[PDB]
Amino acid sequence: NTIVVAASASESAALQYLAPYSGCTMGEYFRDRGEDALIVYDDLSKQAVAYRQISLLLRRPPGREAYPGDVFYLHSRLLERASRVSEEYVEKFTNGAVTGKTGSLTALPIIETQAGDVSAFVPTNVISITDGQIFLESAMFNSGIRPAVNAGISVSRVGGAAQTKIIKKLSGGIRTALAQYRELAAFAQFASDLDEATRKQLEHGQRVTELMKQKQYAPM
């Protein structure tokens, strides 16, 4: 079910710069004919490094962290192609062959940061372009929570419109329990002196936080 596009580390910087656009064109084949596709860009950071190498060797004028002035345009051109198109666009594209179906391309870009610095130039650009972020932390990864998702600062702007009815009904109390555990997490070694309802909220938050762990290669 998967097309794999590869531009490895010993290849030319022009091929590493063009690989996400080539993979996006292959994914857009399915969006324009009323089918649905999902694309992963495993390092957009290295694509920005290869484009910085191309721009500095062409003697184009540098800016912050020696990136050129069109690096936001480089990532915005790529990430605006991931979209949901209407049934009218699909009927216009296929000349009436596909009728009554929407088409889509979903993107999951991946950005590597340096010691949690999300305010560097390329991460600030991709955070500002996207519809939401999943932050992974090294300290939660070392503490045994193997999907290391910080639920306090991760956000989706689409939200409960992108959920089925049973998941949207059950997820709100789990969100409330995780927020109560983040407020009450310092009290766990001194829980014997707490109030009964505060202890009950702390134990429910510990149980929900222990439930959020999951193994690799076992999707539910």
Partner: protein, 116 residues
């Protein structure tokens, strides 16, 4: 570092060592400001087991005998897994933290504890 490559037992010993050390990394400045007595009991047991884990990670080397003065040790994988599992299970909670520094196998830590 996968359970299908090294086995389940090696993986739980390594993740237990990393969990205890990551906990003690968050407790170090608290003991540096207020002191040892101001924690709970499980924090005191975990800080003592963690300091013994941090001393037992050390090893004398054969190529470093010009720097230490002490002879070097070769420690097998099963000796390492059994020693770190014995520190994690509380089977050496009675030994001082200086007994695990520059020894090799867990039996040498027991022999060094009788000389302090």
């Amino acid at each position: 570092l996968d359970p299908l490559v090294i086995g389940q037992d090696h993986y739980d010993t390594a993740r237990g060592v990393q969990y205890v050390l990551q906990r003690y990394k968050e407790l170090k400045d608290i003991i540096a400001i207020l002191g040892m007595d101001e924690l709970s009991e499980a924090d005191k047991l975990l800080v003592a087991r963690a300091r013994k884990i941090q001393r037992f990670l050390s090893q004398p080397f054969f190529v470093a005998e010009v720097f230490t003065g002490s002879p070097g040790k070769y420690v097998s994988l099963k000796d390492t897994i059994a020693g770190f599992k014995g520190i994690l299970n509380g089977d050496y909670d009675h030994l001082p933290e200086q007994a695990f520094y520059m020894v090799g196998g867990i039996e040498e830590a027991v022999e060094k504890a009788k000389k302090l």
